Symmetry: C2
Subunit: 211 residues, 2 copies
């Protein structure tokens, strides 16, 4: 790993997509011994409040990545980032489709507050083929031209990760929602963990595979 980018324990990020605070805290706390980085999105935050971020940090001391896929005009992006970082997020995921100024607005606030911005270069759902896939390489290049050091790329396609690496370099931090860890620095896992009877064992299981 690279010293200048975030260290994710066991290279495994938990995508906590549950919308109930009780279930969300229960699962996260149970895997803290294996995972130190949790990705939280709007489903949970809008349902339980932004204060849930501080709770995850105060109760588990985990790093929090806010998957808010920020995609507004510069001034609004700035406010969203400031509010999110104020709430305690260590990093935020932002869309690149809105352009360079919208991304820079996010980078500025992260610079001011000592936090991080992850640029989302591509998505893997079927609809992504319409506009996102074709803009992926240019969005990645835009990130490079913005000094972005953290990226979120696809995962269901290995050849896409190699393509992304050719653009962002071997040093930047890359996370993807075995062979994947040959290009990405960490993998994001949701269902397989937060839906298992014993998420503690679930996490330990996938980690053993990384071993």
């Amino acid at each position: 790993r690279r010293v200048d980018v975030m260290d994710v324990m066991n290279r495994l990020i938990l995508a906590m997509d549950l919308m109930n605070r009780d279930d969300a805290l229960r699962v996260t706390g149970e895997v803290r011994e294996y995972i130190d980085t949790v990705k939280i999105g709007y489903p949970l935050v809008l349902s339980e409040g932004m204060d849930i971020i501080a709770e995850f940090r105060k109760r588990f001391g985990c790093r929090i990545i806010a998957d808010f896929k920020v995609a507004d005009i510069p001034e609004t992006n700035e406010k969203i980032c400031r509010a999110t970082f104020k709430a305690g997020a260590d990093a935020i995921i932002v869309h690149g489709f809105p352009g360079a100024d919208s991304v820079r607005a996010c980078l500025n606030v992260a610079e001011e507050m000592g936090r991080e911005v992850f640029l989302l270069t591509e998505m893997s759902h079927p609809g992504a083929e319409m506009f996102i896939q074709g803009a992926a390489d240019e969005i990645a290049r835009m990130g490079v031209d913005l000094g972005v050091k953290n990226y979120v790329g696809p995962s269901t396609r290995p050849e896409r990760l190699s393509r992304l690496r050719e653009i962002i370099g071997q040093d930047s931090f890359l996370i993807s929602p075995g062979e994947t860890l040959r290009f990405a620095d960490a993998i994001i896992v949701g269902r397989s963990i937060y839906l298992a009877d014993n998420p503690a064992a679930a996490a330990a299981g996938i980690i053993e595979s990384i071993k």
Copy 2:
């Protein structure tokens, strides 16, 4: 005006972009006699909580459009929409760049809950030229092919509104952030109102210009 689409009083929507609950409620309440539709975004919701939507409705009885520019995968979009409508929003603004399935997920929840989805076809900030501008017409057409009846388009360029109308038809509802009301059904105003010494007079002023 068309009977099957929302009726916005005075064709003026307030963009309540303030992040403080005290200021937000003060301004909105002061213009309720002129405006019955308020657009709220993440800056306010993330800072004060989603419960602020119910408060705007319970205190002012205004219609609330949640400008969340939803831009995730289908399943997450569904959860965001359900949480937002549960909170009381009458409508939600969604990005079209993530594709047809991501938009349809939103339309499904709106159908289930009797609410509305606004498709954002284009943006006017400088960075929008990179990817959004070139996809605008196709996104608008995608909306038509999804049965979308509510759209958010640009505004700083009249010829773009005419272009949008050529695609969505003369019946669909269109809102834009004088000549504008020749194409859009309602205009969205922020600064000019929520920053004025007396927002009540500010609203009345721009309305007199519409008359």
